[PDB]
Structure formats: C-alpha cells, structure tokens
C-alpha cells in the first residue's frame, strides 16, 4: 500500500524532502529528516491511532515512560534542524523528540514517549512548531504589551521598567532594590516568562550589586543615566562576580568617549550590545562596529528591520518627536542626521544575512514594536533572499540554511546571551515546554497556539458561545494556562544566583517557577548559533560608508514586504 | 439592552465588515481579515433576515470573488463559520471555499 | 478672551541661571573626526579625550548653559564655551575616573588626565 | 546667562509668579514659591542632568538618603500651598518635597532626596500634581466603577455594599461580620484604597459593634434602614468607643423626628453629614442647616454640583424613577417637590464657595457619578468665580485662595473626616505616595498618571503594539501597580483599631497594606482645612429660602460648563 | 483621545444603533435590544447637539412606534435611561414608555 | 480573522471617527476627542490605501481646519501619532499641529 506525497502531506504534514512556503514570503523550508515509522503515525480522533490498546498504552502509570502531552507530527524549525517529529512533554518540560505511541504494537516508539491514560494530545500535523521567542530588549511600560508579544510567538521578556515613568520609557531599567521587588511581585500576574534588568550605573560597586542581590537578572547601561567609562566598568565588574549579562546603549553624543573609549572600558569582558546599528542608540556614527568584536553579543531592535522606503522618514520624525527636537535648531537637526543613517540601516540587513548580527529584539514601546520581532526577522530573510539570492550554503533549492540562521536570532541566541539557554530558547530535550504552533499561511505573523510550561497560554480561537471553537470572531485570547494559580506553574521568573541563594522568592512570596541565570560571562560571539562571524567593520566618519574586511556594503530599500497588508486589518 | 458576551463580540464583526466595505468601495482589493469580516457579517445579517442555513451556505459563496481580493486570499480561506440567531434559534453556518 | 485650555500666563522678567558663581570662557577644539555633544552637568575636565582645551580650566566646572541642554562640537570644530563652578560639596566621582573626590586636588586630576591622554594638560 | 520666563516655563514648568489656567475654566493658579536652584533643575534624558557623576549620585546605596522615585519639577496644588518642587518617594511614601539630585555638584539638594542608582524618574515639568482624591460616599455596586474613579484622579474609596443588592444600591452599607469579611477579601483585587462602612442601625450595641470588630472602618446611618433616634444614638456610642466615623443620611420623611430631633440624638458628638443639601437624602426641607454646626463634617454628593439649567429636570425624574413614584399620585409628587429644591441646590453652590460645606463626594451609582467628584468641584469653583468674582482674600489676580479651598474638599477634608489623614489626603512628607499628574489642559477632567504607593496604577497611554506609547488610541489603562501581587503593596485597606488588634487581616489572609482608622472623634468643623465656617443656616419651611446670619442666598443656574463638551466623546 | 471607561463603552451603543438602523432600513421589524440601542443613541446624540433633558424626555417617545418593532417589544421597554455630556455637563435622561 | 490586540483596539478609532464624521455632517463644531479620532482614522486609512509616511505627514495637516472645531481645540492638539500597516509593514506617522 503506497500513499502519494500530496495525500501524505495533507494527512500527516510534510515528510523528508517536502518543502513548505513561510507565509507569503519567497522562503521555502525542506523537511531534513523524519522520526516516524510510515504506517504508525500517531493521530487523535474518532477511529484514529491514539486509542486504548492501540496507539494509546492502557497499562502504564504516568511515572512509567508516559507523557503528559504529545504534539503529533510537528514540523520543527529550530537552530538544531528543520525536521518532522512528535514532541513529548512531561512536568512542563520537553522530555522527548521522536516517535510517540504504544510500544505494545508500534515500531520505532521513543521509549519515554508512551501515550497513556495520562496523555493529552495536540495535533501538530500541517503546523510549523518553533521555540517561543526570547525578547531581551523589553521596556515594561504598559501591561497590554504582553498579549501583543504572545500573539507574535514571544514567550520570554527580558528588560526593565516600572510602567510609564520617564526612566522606563527611555531605558530597560528597574532601578534599585525596592523597584525590583515591586516589579517581581507585579510579574506574578504576567502570563509570560520575565527577567528584570537593574540600572548599570554607579561609581561604587555596592549600589549596583544590591540590585542583583534584590532579584535582578542582569543590568542595563544606558546613555540617559550616563554611559560613562565608570558606569561601564563597575557594571561589568558586578556582572563578572554575579554571573549575569550586561546590555549597553552607548554614549551617542561621544561626550566622555568615542567607541574605542567604550571598548577600552569594556576591556574584553562579555557584553550584549543593544540596537547595534545605532538608530536606537549609540556612539554616532560608528557604534555598529561593535558587531565585529569577539566579546560582543550584538542584537538589532526591530523598527530598522528590514530597510524599507518609509524607514528613514518614520525614524527621523520618531527621533524628533521623542527628543522634543526642533527642525529650526541646527544642533538638533545635526544630531538627528548623525543618528538616523540610511548607510548603516542598509548595511544592517546584510550584516544579519552574513551572521554578523546574532540577535533580534523589540525595544518594545521605547523605539520598537512588542509584537514584530518574529515578523521582521522573516521579512529581513525574505528581502535578503530576493536581493542576494539563496545563500551559497543552500541545497535542493531550499532556504534551510538561511531559515536556521534567522530563527536562531530570536530563539537560542538571546537565551545564550542572557544565561537562560539551559531553560528556554530551543526545542531540545530537557528544556521548558515553551512552544509556538503556526499555520504555514500565518507563519511569523499570527501564532495559532502558544504553549507555556506545557499548557496552552494564548490561542487564535473563535466565538466562546459557539457549538465549536472555529466560528467568528477568531482572535487572540488568553487560555487556561493564564488563569488562577496556573499562571505560576506555566511561567518562569529568571533571577540572579545571589538573590536565589538569599531567599528573595520566599521573602516576596513569589509562586512562579524560579529560573537561575548562569554561564553568561565565559561566552562570546563564537557561541552565537549560525551567527558567529567576527570581522573588522569600518564605518567612514565622513560618508558613513560601511566596509567589512575593506568591502563596501550598500543595499537598497524595498517598497513592499510580505507578512504585511495581506494579513493586518490596520 | 442586556448584551451577553457573544452579542458584544459579534458587534466587532459588523464593524470590521463596515470598515472592509468602505475599503472595497474606494477600489481596494481586500485582504484576508477584510474578506472574512465581510462574509461573516453577511451570514449573521442573513440569519437576522430569516434566511435558512441552506440559503446562506449557497449565498456565502457569491459575496466576494477572486477579483475582489488580493493574490492568495481565496486559497487562504478554506471556510468561514458563523453562529447567529435564526427564527428557530442559534445555528451554525459553514461556507466552504467562499471565494473561488 | 480666546481660551487656550491649560495655557500659561508667565510673569515678567528673566531667570538668571547659576547666579553668584564664577564664569570662565575657554576655547575648545574637537580634534576627532566624529561629533561630540557635552551636557550641562558633566565635570568639564572629564569630557572626551579628543577635545583639546586647557584641562586645568575645566576642573571644578561645568557648562554655564540651561540645565539639561548641551554644547555640540562637529568634527574639527573649535569654539568658545562659558563654564560655571560646580556647587554642593564640589566633589566628583566616576564619569571618567579622573577625580573620585574633591575637585580641589588639581595636581592629581591633571596627572591622571595626562597619563590617559586627555588632550590639553599644559 | 538669563532665560526668558516663556522659555523657562516651557522647559521646566512654571516658576514663582507664573500662572496656569485650569483646563478650559477661567481659574488661574499662581506658583507661590519654588524649591529649585536656577541652573541646577533636575531632568532626565539624553545629555540631561540625572546621569551618573552629575545630577545622579554614583556612590550611595539605597539606604543612604537615596530615593526610589523622583518626580521632577512638579507644580503642586494642595491645601498646604501651590508651589514648585521635586517630590521624593521611598518605601511607597512621600519622604521629601524640595530639591532632588546630587549633593556632590548641585546647590540646594534636600538631604534625603539623592538621585542614585536606585532611583526611578517621572518628569512632572509642565504637569500639575495633586493628592489622590478621597471619595467617602461610595456604593460598591459594580466593580467597573473603580477604573471610572481612577480616570478622574480618585485613589481612596470609602463606603459600602456587596454589589447590586438593593441594600447596597440604596445605602453605603456592608452589613454584618460575614458580608464585611467577604468584601475585605473582594478588596484584595480592587486597585484603589478602600474602607468599608457597616450598618449604623440597631437598638443594642453588640450587633453594631461586631461589624467594627469584623473589620469595618466606620458606620453609615441611612433612612432606608431606619434613621431613628435609637439607631443614631447607638451608632455614635459605638463610634466614640471604636474611634471610627459615622456618616448619616437622615430621616427625609421626618417620620420619627425633625432635624432638631436628629441633632438632639447626635447630642454634640462628631458626625459626617452626607449630601448635606438634601436632594440625595435628608430631613425635608431643612437638612442643609446641619452644615452650620460645629460637630458636623458636611459633604455634598456630586449631581447637584454645580447648579445648572438641566439639574432640576434630571433630579426630579431620577428621584421619580428610583422610588417608583407616580406623577398622578399626589403624595409622591408632594414628596418629590419637598426633596428636589432649586432654592437649596442654588444655595449649596454659595455654601461651597464660603467654606460652609467642607467636602465633596460622589454617591457613586446610587445618586452620583463615580468619575466626577474632581470634575464637578472645579466646575463649581469656576461658576462661583464667574458669578461672585475673585474671593476678597485673592491677590495678583490669581485664584489661589479659591483653588486651595476647593482642592481641600476632595483631598484632605474627607481624609480628616474619616480618620485616615495620617496616611492619605495631601502631598506632605510622611504620607502614602498617592499622586495624580495632570496636563493643565486636562486638569480635573482626565488624569495623565495615577501613582498608588509609589508605582503608577493607571495611565492615559496609547497603542501597546507601537514603537512609542503615545500613538492612538490613547485611553485610560491599568498599569503594572495593579498586576499580580503588586496590587497588595500599592493599596491600603483601612480598618478599625479593634479588627487590627484582633488579627482580622491574618484571619482572612489579607495581603494589602493595612491602614488604621484613628483620631476622628475629637475633631469638628474647625478642623476642615479652608472650609471651617460655623454659622446659623435658616431654611424657610414655607418658601425654602436659605439665609446665612439672616442674609438671603439666591443663585442662578448656568446653561454651559467648562470641563464638558470640549473633552468628552459622549 | 484620552478615552475614559464610559466613552469606550458608549461607542458600542452608537455601533449597535447603526446596526439596528440598517436592519430597519431593509424593512425588518426591530427586536428588544435593537430598539433600546436606537433610542439610547438618539438620546446621547441629542445631548451632543445641545438639546435639553426636557426636550429629549419628549422626543424619545417618538423615535420608534409599535409598527417599527416586533410583537411585545413596546411592553418589554418600560423606560430607557442614558447619561451623556450636555453643554452643562453629564445629565441623566429617562424616557418613560418610549414605544406606545 | 485572526485579530491581534492592536487590530481590535484600532477598530474603535475607526468607529469614533465615523461617529465624529456624522456629528460634523449635521453641522456641529467638533471637540478634542472627535478631532483626534477623525485625523487618526484618516492616517490609518491612508496607510491602507498605500500612501507614503511623507504624504500622510502633509495631508494630516489639511483634514480639519480651526473652523471645523471648538475654540481651543487647535491649540490642545500638538500632534497626532498613529501606526498602521503600509505596503512595507508597520510605520509611525506623526502629524505636527494638524489644525492651525
Ligand atoms: O546586496 C546586494 N547584492 C550583492 C552584493 C554583494 C554580493 F557579494 C552579492 C550580492 Cl547579490 C543587493 C542587490 C540589489 C539590492 C540590494 C542588495 Se543588499
Ligand atoms: O451670588 C451672586 N452674587 C452675589 C451675592 C452676594 C454677594 F455678597 C456678592 C455677590 Cl457677587 C450671584 C450673581 C449672579 C448670579 C449668581 C450669583 Se451666586
Ligand atoms: Se518617546 Se513619545
Ligand atoms: Se435607582 Se434605578
Ligand atoms: Ni537604547
Ligand atoms: Ni530600549
Ligand atoms: Ni444618601
Ligand atoms: Ni448614597
Ligand atoms: O533602546
Ligand atoms: O446617598
């Protein structure tokens, strides 16, 4: 008995060699391998395989190799591969990637992926499954930002803020022990994973370190607090002792130093360089040269991503309104022209494509869009395919190499940068079950179901009064993982080792799972998955021309993007 | 008025349909959510008019044609489902492949 | 009697900033090839190494400009600025780590500035 | 270097002698004094003063005179003055009003207002800052009423009710130990300060007192439960023992007594007379004579405020519909005509202006508008300025005297009446940091940011999906102070001393800050800030003519108000 | 815009009235929530026009007649109440037995 | 339809603009939130039409004039900001002093 490939893919999702278009882009992903045994595919429903004595085992208790949850027939898109498998979840973690069902009667069942009495089923046939997005540049300004993030497949928010206070509206900072404690308590009600950054500013160690001991997960150095050589130095001294990451928004004004002075203060220590292109902040005009250095973990924020015909007009004005700049004050116009540069925004597209910028992020509500990190990653990859062609590394006419390079930018690389990749950032055995299901037609645009800690937290679903869940209006809605005390078990508060050792969770009555930040001081650029290139980036101080090993990087903006007006009501 | 949860939500479908109809009237090819809103509101207004489920299953295939919508939209919409109060109570209408 | 909601009716007169403090005019040159903008309240001796000026005349001082404004130096630009005296305890910590104490320690500030290549130690 | 006054006010907000119009009213407030040192103003942003080693101190730990929060350049409007200052907050309380920054380099820094690593910043330049409104006549009928209150700058709700039960729809009463316990638990989820009134009715002490011991913060005597001499007497006996306030809605019907009988039952004991004009309830027609007595703390509710051309038509009908009265039953028409009186509503405007009625309140959802206490206070002051001119006490052509008289009516005076002015009701050092920021163009109409316990709880802010927080739609939204466990630390449940001593918070598992009600039995009219007038008010029983020391009080209604159709979408 | 909670809710009454008015224009007898929405929106738009409470108490009895609505609807509506911002601030309008 | 949070909120701006446009058509001078709604909806519909950010920065200054609005409204509106999906994705439009 043989099934043609069209009929097979319609029933079980695609298999080895089949390709799938990402949304309305020109990007195609190809199934590299498949863990199934053809004829023993798991599926659930009337007369289907996962039934007692058949594909469901009726003998084993939950502890005996039985899953709490099986995602059947997933097309996984991850730094680790693009492939077809069943995903097994237990105790809120990914315990198996392979083939689920019943060893009684099926060949090839992964030994700890038994479907038993205890097992829930999610059908992933025809879906793309990714890790939850890790956004490491979040301003906590407006709690309504969390659903915006979940709707575009983000599951972890790292950043700072106390709400719409000016410090928070400019900087990813929750300053001092008391504001940190208050925002850890606020976090008990946010249905997403969270880590809080303290103020990376001071000339004495103790005012900075007491933020780490209070429960901060990292620090932010921002020019609006004084991105001075002293603040840089003390923050990295603290970070090296505490095993947490430091993010920097450098001295745009070059007031206390040029880029080389900031790099000298860093002194070869690891640092996460935010919005490395520099429209979002940093030494004018050459901050993007940071992305060539081995000790720099470089991210973009999203409004420059990718370079379009409206980008400069929107940014020049955005910068003018936010800094209350006057079009008739020459110093204000000179500042804006030094900061918003078509030359560096165009080159940023190519630096992403080359694996020289390792990460994406939002800059949510400060100069970036909470719900467009995943969206704009794929728009960038699509523009680069259109302008530069398939990468030389591709085969079979698939875009798998580019797709692994780009998915790494918002999944595994931020997680590694922050010291949280032991818990989150990829679909791997032993990691927390933060999973996003996508219909391919909506891939990167609107998530179908967002799983947090093994329970659905957010879903595109219809009329709650209907006979079935698909009638209109289909909209993003919070699901049972966000309700009551289940919000505690489905989400992680990431905290410093010292705050955990000092009992901060018990002191504050935190019920959320507690994640330990670790291993983020002995990493570098080489540790960024698929995005590990170190090189000399030259930015001409007169012309803002970008060169990589003496080669000029020019790019053109595009007038239209996929993943745009076909999808959005506004 | 005594609005229940569904009545409040379904007002937003009517509003999205009115928005989409204005866009179509000024000559735009409609996108995915615009097209779904127009067909959905058509079904619920048809139920209110007292049409049968079978009439609306037929009519909903003729509300928008492929020339009314952007490339790919016809193939993005496999079916549109709506519940509304008919003269004989709430019923489900499913329109299969509404835009050919 | 047209009403602008929430409008101000300011009093007559002008506000004198930094009243009673010594003022000093110095010329400053951006010898670098990138722009440098300097805020009202940075200890002036601790600004960017490529600004050339008599570093001793920046000790214990800052720009005499409205609070929260800045002076801009384009690449290669030389101009005069007016400084005023720091107040309070007249101590500076951090920033470029040139002072870390009283601004009265001019000898120590200038020795550190010279060592680290802050232009204009004379 | 000199700055002209227009440019100074645009950058830092107004300074000494400058005036600011309140919304679209004819009321002007003048800056009386300014705590700044000109040239050392604090401000936050790119190249601004509050940066490490500059206006931010980089040496001190949080405990060492460092603030958790600095509101820069606030124009304070308070019973204590109209003046310019920085406001420093720490541990959720106002710790300093003066000049913030860094003693290292700035002159005139208030010693405990250091901006340090631990300090968040809110820019208040160009804003008016007031205390949170204290509403002492709240019916707990519909939880949606809390956001309505926050949106018009109310931060404390004192009253009663169990939801839309008839007892609660008529009376500010949570009756008996069990209903009190249930509503204290409900209060754990309300993002506003709360105190609960028990039923001030009984002929034995124990049924009334057990409500105080259960956690009530006061009592309400209401005619719908029998505002008899016995209920009045027993309630005030309880109140004097328990140190809580009693509110009264007296016997409109004069069934068991006239006003003099109610005053004899009170017997010189302190009492808060609700809706003292009497449209909202009380001895017909003369209840408003209560406002002349030294032992009476008199409040208005808001629908009579101020007297307009639609007031009588709206009230006559409101009263007819609410009491199911028939226009063709002569006793019903006589009752309505005895209760809704243009003579006493007109005089109520003047009694407010003279400082004879000390307080405003809503009567939320029973006969008053949850979100219009602040609004209607200012409309009343504006109508009185238009009709009676500047008060004789004014100078410089400012309305500062009238503005302090009127702001006292919804801030400090209710707080004093209730026994909670040690915690709330004014911008003073040592009080809880309940602060409302207003754009002057929206003053008294729509709050910009409402701070509760030093964290923003409510804000007018825009699209949560946007690059910046200002794009449309700008609407009132709950902020991080309302989320998770932070709702506990940012809000106060006010309770009797006896319930606190008996461990009610622990018994019920209350996590909110617990406020003690105290010192409200040895106060009187003389203790009402700017509103301390005692006088003989005569209400003619035939004509309802009002006289104050034998002088007739007539007023005209107005056809238009400011703070109305310019602002509201409906 | 600075919308407060009431402004956001009351937009939904205007929307329900626009829906009901379209239903009436295509010849349907209106139901209970449709009739309440039309009269309610009429009151709030009248306040915005600067009419008096007394004018709207009178006019609201002449917006819909018993022939505009389904059997029983006139007797289901004892009165319609709405608050809106008049030139002199928020006022309550009650319309008694709006449909005879 | 797959509405996300922003799509749901922004429907309410279109609705407020339709309300304000009806008020203007019956001869009312518009108030602050009415004027902001009209200009905001104009920007988002312009993005949907495929205009540039620069076109809408210019056009948004000519949607309403001071004679269309109540006294003080021009001076209450320093700028109107809106984000919408252009052909090249979400962009921010700021209109400076939209009503002179
Ligand atoms: O990047 C582009 N071209 C290019 C440059 C250097 C290469 F080695 C290869 C290519 Cl295809 C290009 C061509 C057209 C428009 C945009 C761009 Se980014
Ligand atoms: O109160 C008014 N006039 C007045 C009465 C007694 C005074 F001693 C002073 C004045 Cl201005 C007035 C004048 C016109 C309209 C309303 C009123 Se409340
Ligand atoms: Se940034 Se407004
Ligand atoms: Se009171 Se209805
Ligand atoms: Ni930044
Ligand atoms: Ni940022
Ligand atoms: Ni009452
Ligand atoms: Ni009441
Ligand atoms: O940023
Ligand atoms: O009342």
Residue numbers in the entry:
A (entry chain C), D (entry chain C): 1 to 570
B (entry chain A), E (entry chain A), F (entry chain A): 1 to 100
C (entry chain B): 5 to 126
Can I see the authors' text?
Urease, depending on the organism, is a nickel-containing homo- or heterooligomeric amidohydrolase that is commonly expressed in plants, fungi, and bacteria, but not in animals/humans, and catalyzes the decomposition of urea to ammonia and carbonate. The activity of urease in microorganisms, which in turn determines the accumulation of NH3 and the increase in pH in the microbial microenvironment, is a key factor contributing to the persistence of notorious bacterial infections. Organoselenium compounds, and, in particular, Ebselen, have been classified among the most potent low-molecular-weight inhibitors of bacterial ureases. Although Ebselen is considered to act as a broad-band thiol-targeted inhibitor, it inactivated S. pasteurii urease (SPU) with a Ki of 2.11 nM, an exceptional value among mammalian or bacterial enzymes.
Crystallographic studies on SPU inhibited by the most efficient Ebselen derivative reveal the molecular basis for this striking reactivity, namely, the formation of a unique chemical modification of the catalytic cysteine thiol, a novel mechanism of urease inhibition. The Ni-containing active site region is completely conserved with respect to that of the native S. pasteurii urease, with the dinuclear Ni(1)–Ni(2) cluster (where the two Ni ions are 3.7 Å far apart) being bridged by the Oθ1 and Oθ2 atoms of a carbamoylated αLys220* residue and a hydroxide ion W(B). The unbiased omit electron density Fourier map calculated before the addition of the ligands in the refined model revealed two positive and unmodeled regions in proximity of the two solvent-exposed cysteine residues of SPU, namely, αCys322 and αCys555, thus suggesting covalent adducts formed on the Sγ atoms of those residues. The unmodeled electron density peak located next to αCys322* revealed a peculiar oblong shape, suggesting the presence of two spherical ligands possibly forming a dinuclear Se cluster bound to the Sγ atom of αCys322*. Similarly, the anomalous difference electron density Fourier map showed an oblong shape overlapping to the omit map, confirming the attribution of two Se atoms, which were therefore both successfully modeled and refined with a 70% occupancy: Se(1) was refined bound to αCys322* Sγ at ca. 2.2 Å, while Se(2) was refined bound to Se(1) at ca. 2.3 Å. The electron density proximal to αCys555* revealed a different kind of binding. The electron density was successfully interpreted by modeling 47 with full occupancy and bound to the αCys555* Sγ atom through its Se atom (at ca. 2.4 Å). The mobile flap region of the determined X-ray crystal structure of SPU bound to two Se atoms was found in the open state, with a mainly conserved protein backbone conformation with respect to that of the native enzyme.
